[PDB]
From a paper:
PRC2 is composed of four core components: EZH2, EED, SUZ12 and RbAp48, although it may interact with several other proteins.
The structure in complex with compound 1 reported here shows that the ligand recognition is nearly orthogonal to the SAM-binding mode. The pyridone group anchors the ligand through its reciprocal hydrogen-bonding interactions with the backbone of Trp624 from the conserved GXG motif of the SET domain. Nonetheless, the rest of the ligand occupies a hitherto unanticipated pocket that is partially formed by the I-SET region from the SET domain as the base, and the activation loop forming the lid of the pocket. All three sites of acquired resistance mutation provide interactions for the molecular recognition of the inhibitor 1. The C-terminal end of the structure reported here, often referred to as the post-SET, is largely disordered. Thus, analogous to kinase inhibitor terminology, pyridone inhibitors could be classified as type II PRC2 inhibitors that not only compete with the cofactor SAM, but also occupy the extended pocket that is unique to PRC2, accounting for their exquisite selectivity.
Residue numbers in the entry:
A (entry chain E): 67 to 380, 386 to 426
B (entry chain A): 9 to 72, 81 to 124, 166 to 180, 193 to 199, 219 to 246, 260 to 308, 432 to 472, 517 to 733
C (entry chain S): 562 to 688
Write the structure that this text describes.
Amino acid sequence: SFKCVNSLKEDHNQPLFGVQFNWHSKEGDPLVFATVGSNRVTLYECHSQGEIRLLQSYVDADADENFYTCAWTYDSNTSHPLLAVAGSRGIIRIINPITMQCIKHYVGHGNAINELKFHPRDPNLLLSVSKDHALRLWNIQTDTLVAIFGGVEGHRDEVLSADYDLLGEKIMSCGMDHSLKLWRINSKRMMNAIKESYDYNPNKTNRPFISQKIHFPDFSTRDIHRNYVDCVRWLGDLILSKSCENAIVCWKPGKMEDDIDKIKPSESNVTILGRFDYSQCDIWYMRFSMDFWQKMLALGNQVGKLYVWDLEVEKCTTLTHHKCGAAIRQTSFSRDSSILIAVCDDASIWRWDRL
Amino acid sequence: EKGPICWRKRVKSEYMRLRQLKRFRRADEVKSMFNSNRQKIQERTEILNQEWKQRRIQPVHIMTRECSVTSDLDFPKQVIPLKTLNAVASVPIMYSWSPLQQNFMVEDINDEIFVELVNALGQLDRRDEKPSDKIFEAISSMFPDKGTAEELKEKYKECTPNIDGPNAKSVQREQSLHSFHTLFCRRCFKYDCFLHPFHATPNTYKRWSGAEASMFRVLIGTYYDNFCAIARLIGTKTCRQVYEFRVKVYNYQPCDHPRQPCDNSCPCVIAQNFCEKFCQCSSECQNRFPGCRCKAQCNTKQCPCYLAVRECDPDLCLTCGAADHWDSKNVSCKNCSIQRGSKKHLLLAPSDVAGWGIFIKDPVQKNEFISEYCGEIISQDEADRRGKVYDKYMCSFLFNLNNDFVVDATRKGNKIRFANHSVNPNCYAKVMMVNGDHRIGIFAKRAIQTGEELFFDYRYSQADA
Amino acid sequence: NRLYFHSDTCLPLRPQEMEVDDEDEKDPEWLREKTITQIEEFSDVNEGEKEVMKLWNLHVMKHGFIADNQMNHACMLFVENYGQKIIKKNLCRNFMLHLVSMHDFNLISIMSIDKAVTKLREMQQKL
Ligand SMILES: CCc1cc(C)[nH]c(=O)c1CN1CCc2c(Cl)cc(OC3CCN(C(=O)[C@@H](C)O)CC3)c(Cl)c2C1=O
Ligand SMILES: [Zn+2]
Ligand SMILES: [Zn+2]
Ligand SMILES: [Zn+2]
Ligand SMILES: [Zn+2]
Ligand SMILES: [Zn+2]
Ligand SMILES: [Zn+2]
Ligand SMILES: [Zn+2]
């Protein structure tokens, strides 16, 4: 299954909150991953015999910044990879690793950003999830705010995680209010708002772009977890989510036979398909991840144990190492699933090679 | 005929069978869904992989203050330069909130298996020979909490249709009208209104097919004996056909005490409040507020409305301007700003003190109305509960409305929520009685210039003991 | 002489916009959907009554009627604006029940019932 092939340590000694492999990387190009912790963004390149090559590192001019999340995209024209980062200050930064500069920045969230996700089909649509109780959909081409997902029937506490589905037709969000909310982005309202954001040119007008204020989700539940929900990922049309109750719950909106795209907003039902058990992960802000093919699932715990599940169960390996005893904050799989990276509370990086 | 111990055993045995069946059945549905879902993962994941194959995205290269990376697995120490991300100015902290133009009131074995079990027990009862009571007594013996042997017979044995529908029944006038009667708020002309908790008192709503019949029973209550008008409205019956069918500071709350005057026992009189247009008392009630006979203004002690700390009522104040020109906000009467929502344009920007602040777009005169301080209407208890959380954040955006309610601008409110506190303000807050509702008006304490920050003394709104 | 921000998005105003932040409209859309949703939550209310109530509330919220003297005009304007929806969604009789309930509440005159019903019937003739 997996061999621990390298361990790295960043000089700041602060928790590393995010890891993301660049899945846009060409077939044959070396496998690159980004790291976020302290007020730093670090880029790495994977090589044979466990070799991790330190490529780039950025530091916010503000010492009080603390990056929590990052996400990779690409510029449609230039064909350059782009990396979005954000944390405690509520500012989104779009870094260009080819040009080695901050190419864009968005201020607008009234609090810390806990998650950043790029639309699986449109590289310009960026979703940010905030401590302010709202989600924001940005158009990174026209620098417009397409929609605000929050309000009367939005999250009542800090939004901790969100995920688009495979084709980018809908978003599933979760948070400290114990809620998991569905926000459809293939609706006529949302498709037009995306279209209109692309037509927007502030030079050809004196009026601001009109952002959609989506106060109502397309489904909402509080009956999956008894505490805060800190990670949510779609598994096809099913949902994978966790709290501090030492389990990842696999579930779906409505009754067993209810189709995801036929679920009415007033739906009071949920169907729990099953759960993935583990231990010592009762601390807040602990994220699970999947490979591109959604066949593998990984989750680290507060004492450095790394759990890997084979999702094709229509199996659990406990990856462990004597020198790894810190809280594993997040994991990342290479596109091809050959490399698995884990980041910790002690500025350490752990490389696990599949063989 | 089988005995009680036997039946209890059968109940157990059958319920255990139905449960282990549902279990293994459902386990399979689960495996079927994961499998059917896996195909969707495959299909969509190939669409994405195909789109990725059509892209040639540029690889990242090495960079060139510095930083190092160390290895606990003895790989060599690495050193590169640390590129500085240029400072970006942040905005003050702000949490999600919903815009409001008016206040918003906020208040402080299953049946599927049970039926299956009964039917399974009936099949054993049937097979025994070579709806039975000896079955209900056994289910109640094994599930006492679910109910008694009688209650389970009742449970096992198991609205008004629209007059426009095919199931339209012939019913009583009150049956037909009930939903409209109990959901309508006379005070704000809406059904299930966001402002008034209590339902309207029964005196407030008083002054041949199923559908034709029900409409007749309704129309006779309004057009007592004008069968010409009853026929006109029914449309499918005549002047004669219809005739032939016949032959076969406390919060205000409307008072309703039939055959009793508004005396010392009247809730309005007790609450030391005037009776309003919504009260069900006599038209000659001596406690009703008469309104004002002003020609214009209504902004001095000369106006009984203004003097009573009330806005002008549009149904009583017929000469000042409060009743006319609904298209306009600048009306002859200067005592109807809250009710009309004649607010001044306000602007959001970081305060010159801390956090966010509110700035007036255009000049305002001393005592001129700026905006209403809108929010959620919550009970004193809800405010005590909410306050526990608020203190953790050092935020306090809730203000006493009267003895019974607090307006809280934290979750819902309007732009004026951004007016900061000051013991040296340029604004003041005035709770007014506005058509039976207590509403907070924010007025200029002195003339104010274009772009000036707004501040009011929070303590005056908090000080109610 | 200061950077202003939109209250709904917290994004800054350009000098082009010249101190205009008016996402402070009389009827916030969310209230329109909150009302629609709430009426639907009732088990004891039928689908006919529900749709008339929803349409009436949406009408009252749009025009912001605040006086009882505006109630006669409100019913007339309800026919003009929502009459097509009433006829098409088959809520002609439920609307009739709403008018008499309004008369019971002392908000509208007896002639308003006739006038509104007469107006809806000739609107149906146009179809
Ligand atoms: C009226 C807004 C206003 C006014 C003025 C004059 N000046 C300003 O700067 C602001 C902005 N502002 C200040 C900071 C802030 C904090 Cl620190 C906590 C808040 O609200 C908690 C958020 C968690 N709460 C919850 O209930 C969650 C945990 O469920 C309780 C209320 C809020 Cl609502 C705010 C906020 O928006
Ligand atoms: Zn009301
Ligand atoms: Zn009385
Ligand atoms: Zn009274
Ligand atoms: Zn009275
Ligand atoms: Zn007057
Ligand atoms: Zn008056
Ligand atoms: Zn007046």
